[PDB]
Amino acid sequence: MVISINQVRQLYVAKALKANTAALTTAGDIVPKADTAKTTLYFQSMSPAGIVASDKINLKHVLYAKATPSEALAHKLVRYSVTLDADVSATPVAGQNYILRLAFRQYIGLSEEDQYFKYGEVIARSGMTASDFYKKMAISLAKNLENKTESTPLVNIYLISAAAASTDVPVTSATKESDLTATDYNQIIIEETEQPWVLGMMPQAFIPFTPQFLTITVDGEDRLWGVATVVTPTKTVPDGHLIADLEYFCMGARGDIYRGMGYPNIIKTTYLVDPGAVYDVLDIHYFYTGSNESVQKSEKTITLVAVDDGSHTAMNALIGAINTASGLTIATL
Amino acid sequence: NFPRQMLPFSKKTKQWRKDCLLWANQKTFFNYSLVRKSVIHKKINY
Amino acid sequence: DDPVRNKILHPMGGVAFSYRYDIWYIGTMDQPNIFKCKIKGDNEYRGYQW
Amino acid sequence: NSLLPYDLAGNLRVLRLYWKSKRKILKVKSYDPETGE
Amino acid sequence: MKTLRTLKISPNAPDINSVWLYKGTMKYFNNGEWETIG
Amino acid sequence: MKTLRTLKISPNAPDINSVWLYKGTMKYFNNGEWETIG
Amino acid sequence: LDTFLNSFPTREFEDDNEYYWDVIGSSRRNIPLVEARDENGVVVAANAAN
């Protein structure tokens, strides 16, 4: 992916802390170095092919320094609870065709004009209860949406029985009617899902949807059929695929701007962000000034990235290493 | 965006002659030339 | 019908701005009712800082 | 009025555009039949 | 909202958009079933 | 198979191809007689 | 949207301040009554004679 920069952006991966220049022996450490009079902070990191430093951050010229946790950098997949409207009829009307349309809006392109529509259809019969109806439309929606043939993962559809009321039972295009055996199904939940991710070539983006209902004639007046409520999310996409795609850009400030353009002849750089682990991100945003009439500023930023274990053990040791070395009150997160 | 003048004469169609004029009544507020005064300066003189 | 600017969806399909009816001219005013405003001798600015 | 279609005096806004287009032409080197000019 | 133009006297169910007349019943299609008047 | 189309509001009986409607007694022609619906 | 904003004319103004236009109604009017007094000055209520 490609991000916007405030005149530069550089990233350093912090796999461990060594607190001295001579103790840099493994690739991926970081050492926040400074002098006695706290006027310059810089980060000596061990690259896989030698010691590298940072730009020398002037501590009178910092603008902010705030480190975000990994739980605030996760995309929450939306849910939509689709129930029968109790106003029109509590039970399904025995003659009408019951259709539901899922209106996707960023399919293939990025614009809200690149729309995509999928449907689910169940004809309601006589004697069909509400749990028998949701048992039929969870199969009919999953035959479209979660089929084996569709090129992208569109949505995840689950059922909820009224006894459990929290545990989701998954329905897929291969699930038969004999697997769903419950007489208390009361809603259908449509959850977003994670699109595929390719490092530095496919950004993390999702397809949003809206389950829209088609009208059924109930007493001779054609009334909309169902209702859809947004339910608070239970599944998030973690920080692994956003910081591997953030390192990949900000390694180009210190190195090669082209990454594979012409492949007998490339300069490979080794990346240190594992795309299966979550990370914490600290950003010290600073600038530069000459001590003369050139008072026009040049804003910069640095990014430090540390592995997160849930309790932020690696990152709160790093903020505790910057505050005592350089004299900033960076917030312990 | 003034339409392309570098065309063969068969491709200077009827809609192309309207595009040069629909450009004209949009950019007719413009009076800047580097050897002329402003319209409001000459109007003060007249 | 513009789905990028119109974001509230309607219960009967499509954006809710599509269901907006507007009668722009009732009769003939004997002058232009709706026009746009500009300033005489106001070329729009362009200025480089390099 | 300064870009209105009509005028309250009762006149019509006539906008005449003149512009230099670009025409593709050929320069042909032809020989005189009589002399080699 | 739903017009019914014809009335059909028959012992069988004629059509969604007509009225089924039997001996002492007048049944018409509503809510996915034949609803009787009386 | 008998298809009635019109409904006549009359105090007396109309032609046999129509429904006699008067004061709350829907009457139509069945089995040779005017048979009330209700 | 830009083809909607091209079915409108344009008026060029002389200043970049607030601009006005004057609206008018009619001249002939009807006036509500307050009270009717007879010749001695006492008001004529609803339950009164001619």
**Chain E residues within an 8 Å CB radius of A216:** none
CA geometry: angle at A140 spanning A137 and A145, to 5°? 115
Whole-number Å distance between alpha carbons of A167 and A187:
12
Residue D5's alpha-carbon distances to B24, B37, C31, D14, G19, in angstroms, are 14, 27, 9, 9, 20
Q: Are strands A75-76 and A222-223 parallel, antiparallel or unpaired?
A: unpaired
Whole-number Å distance between alpha carbons of A143 and A141:
5
Q: Is C32 on the interface with D (CB under 8 A)?
A: yes
Whole-number Å distance between alpha carbons of D6 and C38:
17
Residues 6+ apart with CB under 8 A from A299: A6, A7, A63, A285, A286, A287
Whole-number Å distance between alpha carbons of D12 and A333:
71
Phi, psi for residue A245 in degrees, rounded to 5: -80, -10
Which residues sit opposite A288 in a β-bridge? A298
By the 8 A CB rule, do A81 and A189 touch? yes
Dmax (CA) for chain F in angstroms is 28
Residue A117's alpha-carbon distances to A100, D28, E11, in angstroms, are 10, 61, 45
Contact state of D5 with G9 under an 8 Å Cβ cutoff? yes
Which residues sit opposite A75 in a β-bridge? A237
Phi, psi for residue C47 in degrees, rounded to 5: -150, 125
Contact state of B25 with D19 under an 8 Å Cβ cutoff? no
Size of interface B-C (CB pairs under 8 A): 12
Residues 6+ apart with CB under 8 A from G39: none
**Chain C residues within an 8 Å CB radius of A212:** 9, 11, 13
Which residues sit opposite G11 in a β-bridge? C37
Phi, psi for residue B43 in degrees, rounded to 5: -65, -30
Contact state of C40 with D2 under an 8 Å Cβ cutoff? yes
Mutate to test the interface with D, among C29, C35, C42 (most CBs of D within 10 A): C35
Distance from CA of F18 to the nearest CA of E (A): 9
Structure method: cryo-EM
Distance from CA of D22 to the nearest CA of B (A): 6
CA geometry: angle at A331 spanning A328 and A333, to 5°? 150
Judged on CB neighbours under 10 Å (0-12, 13-18, 19+), A164 is exposed
Cβ-nearest to C37 among G1, G5, G13: G13
DSSP run (H or E) holding A101: strand A97-104
Distance of CA A162 to the CA centre of its chain: 31
Beta strands in G1-50 (DSSP E): 10-13
Outline where chain A has alpha helix (H): 130-144, 240-250, 313-326
Mutate to test the interface with A, among C1, C4, C18 (most CBs of A within 10 A): C4
Residues in chain E that come right before a backbone break, where C and next N are over 2.5 Å apart: none
Distance of CA G50 to the CA centre of its chain: 35
**Chain G residues within an 8 Å CB radius of B22:** 6
Instruction: Identify the closest residue of chain G to D1 by CA–CA distance.
Output: G11
CA A197, A201, A205, A207 dihedral sign is negative
A10 closest CA partner among A307, A302, A323: A302
Specified resolution (Å): 3.6
DSSP run (H or E) holding A109: none
A298 closest CA partner among A2, A49, A6: A6
- Length reported for chain A: 333
A76 closest CA partner among A197, A237, A208: A237
Residue B29's alpha-carbon distances to B25, B37, F14, in angstroms, are 8, 15, 80
Q: Tokens standing for G10? A: 């344009």
DSSP run (H or E) holding A103: strand A97-104
A304 closest CA partner among A58, A62, A3, A44: A44
Whole-number Å distance between alpha carbons of A68 and A312:
10
Whole-number Å distance between alpha carbons of A213 and F21:
42
DSSP run (H or E) holding B40: helix B39-45
Judged on CB neighbours under 10 Å (0-12, 13-18, 19+), A259 is middle
Q: Is D4 on the interface with C (CB under 8 A)?
A: yes
